[PDB]
Structure 1
Amino acid sequence: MFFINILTLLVPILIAMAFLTLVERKILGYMQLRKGPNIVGPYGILQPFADAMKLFMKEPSMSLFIIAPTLSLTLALSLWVPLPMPHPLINLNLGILFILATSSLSVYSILWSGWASNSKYSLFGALRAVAQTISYEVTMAIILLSVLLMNGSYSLQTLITTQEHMWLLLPAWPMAMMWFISTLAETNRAPFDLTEGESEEYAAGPFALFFMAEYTNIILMNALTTIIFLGPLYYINLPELYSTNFMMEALLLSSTFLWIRASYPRFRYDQLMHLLWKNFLPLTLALCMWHISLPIFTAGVPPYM
């Protein structure tokens, strides 16, 4: 049974990541007025397998070389375990903290790659990206520490029974405007993808692994938003309906990422760290204090079963 469930949780998400690469290519093409892949197969549903075969065909410290990508991918996959859809695979109180930990770790891979590659050129960008990722994960954590006071438990099931009536966006949107952005930094996506913008050491295989984990994290952060700030409908007789609406909103966010990647330019590193340290951190602290006071100058102090 359990192995069956883990397969259902791991194989389809890899399939979806591949077809997500596809969807990216297609939407970017349609926004740049071109088509996109329409040839390898009907409307381009084989280009991903083509890329996989090609990469695994390409020729090339083994310790770091292997542990880094493996580590990143394993973390990205484990991140999925504790999610409710609607009843989760692993119900863990403190699940979102487990999420944050396993999302922050990959910095170790990013850093080992650099410390191995003697290239000063490589350490340059490695340090830069590591610092930006760290600094944005900080706020990624504080936002949850400021919202979850609405449900006095770090669980991920209580979110649903909370949002039963209303969502979590009509309030807290001063945060969603952030949690929908830091997610564009930890992922090193645009407009913060400088780590892939300024180039002057990832082989084919490890590059495939890095990219797999990157797009997995994309899907997963979008799902986290759809669960936290966009509460679905939990009518207990319709777990199917829950999963369906969740799918819809996840796809919507994953296409918003692409609207962004197409439209905007990239941020200059200094301008970016300025953005964070001088626009989001003060607001973040003040809004956390606000949501700390709310359940005191209002009866809305929630329970802990």
Structure 2
Amino acid sequence: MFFINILTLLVPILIAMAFLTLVERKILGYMQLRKGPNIVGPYGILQPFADAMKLFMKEPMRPLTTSMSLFIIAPTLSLTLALSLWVPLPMPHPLINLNLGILFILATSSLSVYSILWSGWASNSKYSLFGALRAVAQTISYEVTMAIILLSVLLMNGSYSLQTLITTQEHMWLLLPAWPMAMMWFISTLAETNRAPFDLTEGESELVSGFNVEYAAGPFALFFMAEYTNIILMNALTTIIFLGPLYYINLPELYSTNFMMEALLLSSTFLWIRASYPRFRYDQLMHLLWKNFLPLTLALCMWHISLPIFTAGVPPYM
């Protein structure tokens, strides 16, 4: 009965990941005054499945200069960590209930940067090495602020358990007492997931395709499934943390439906953002995060350390 419960997590997520590729191509379409896919199936609904099938019948590439062990490991790691980020998410009851879920999300997210690094390095190509060394630069940019932002929000929550955020937001979104951190949190998630205007590791304009330039076929498909799963998860995580869905102990179906509506809406804003802005320069990404966000995040960390103290609003341990 637990195996059936994995099915009803990993399969709906994978289906939802695929259609995000369709929603991306049609929202980008209509925002660009065109229609996006709409021939492959009714309104393109079969277009995601065509792309998947075609990619797994495409010849896979084994470049002569490549380090095969890491070349193969990297896409496999990418998609594993994308699916593993989901098992602790409470919706409103998580598949795996962890006391330090927030750290499991932080630690799993960091380890997924090594799929970019190892793949790029293992390709033994100049454009793939440029892409990898932007993954290093991008992580050094957003890592420090992203952890501290979480610390600030969790001092109103009382613990690193994700399931306790449901109870913190019983009467109010954390977005209100924390909208400065949500603004900084949201931009971090665009950097965490290599999403425009921060698609610097890929960055088709400057690097031909960045880290995955030497990847074709099914191995390259796994990288994308990982990229789009993370988009849903990071916005799903942002919905739990800051936009707490309605939770009634008698209507757990209500929390999921409301959780989905806000997660879909936030996922759309990622697609909305990609259609609206030019791409950052990856040196300027560091300056954004270290010279703007970091000074503000440290101050808000000190604000939220003191805030429960001088209002006697310390969250409970349990």
TM-score range, shorter chain: over 0.9
CA RMSD of aligned residues (A): 1.2
CA contact (8 A) 2:141 2:285 kept: no
Larger deviation, residues 11-20 vs 203-212: 203-212
Instruction: Normalising by structure 2, report the TM-score.
Output: 0.93
Show CA shifts across 1:171-193 (max 9, x none): 11111111111111111110011
Q: 1:198 to 1:43 in 2, by over 3 A?
A: closer
1:153 and 1:304 in contact (8 A); partners too: yes
1:88 CA drift (Å): 1.2
For structure 1, the residue ranges without an aligned partner over 5 or more in a row are none
How big is each residue's C-alpha offset from its partner over 1:71-128, in whole Å with a ceiling of 9 and x where there is no partner? 1111110110011111111111100100111111012221112322222332222112
| CA distance in structure 1 between the partners assigned to 2:308 and 2:156 by the alignment | 8
8 Å CA contact 2:117–2:135 kept in 1: the answer is no
Query: 4+ residue stretches of structure 1 with deviation over 4 A?
Result: none
SS at match of 1:37: coil
* Bigger mean CA offset, 64-73 vs 41-50: 64-73
Q: What do the CA deviations read for 1:215-234 (whole angstroms, capped 9, x no partner)?
A: 00000000001000001111
SS at match of 2:204: coil
Q: Does 1:251 align with 2:234?
A: no
Do the aligned partners of residues 38 and 121 (structure 1) sit closer, same or farther apart at CA in structure 2, a change above 3 Å counting? closer
Deviation at residue 199 of structure 1 after TM alignment: 6.1
Percent of aligned pairs with the same amino acid: 100
- State the Cα distance separating 1:194 from its structure 2 match: 2.3
The superposition leaves residues 226-270 of structure 1 with CA deviations (integer Å, 9 ceiling, x where unpaired) of 000001111111110000000000000011111110011111122
Distance in 1 (CA, whole Å) between partners of 2:182 and 2:299 is 15
Residue aligned with 1:263, SS = coil
Query: How far, CA to CA, are the matches of 1:174 and 1:107 in structure 2?
Result: 27
- 1:121 aligns to what? 127
Contact 2:71/2:123 (<8 A) preserved? no
Give the C-alpha shift of residue 198 in structure 1: 4.7
Local SS of the residue matching 2:248 = coil
Deviation at 1:274, TM superposition (A): 1.0
CA distance in 1, matches of 2:116, 2:276: 27
- 2:21 and 2:127 map into 1 onto residues whose CA distance is 29
TM-score by length of 1: 0.97
- Cα pair 2:116 2:132 within 8 Å, conserved: yes
Q: Is the 8 A contact 1:104 1:134 kept in 2?
A: no
Residues 40-96 of structure 1: CA distance to partner in whole angstroms, max 9, x if unpaired? 111111011100111011112x31122111111111101100111111111111001
Query: Within the alignment, does 1:263 sit opposite 2:249 as a pair?
Result: no
- Range 236-245 or range 128-137, more displaced: 128-137
Confirm or deny: 8 A CA contact 2:75 2:119 kept in the other structure. no
Answer whether contact 1:227 1:246 (CA < 8 A) is retained. yes
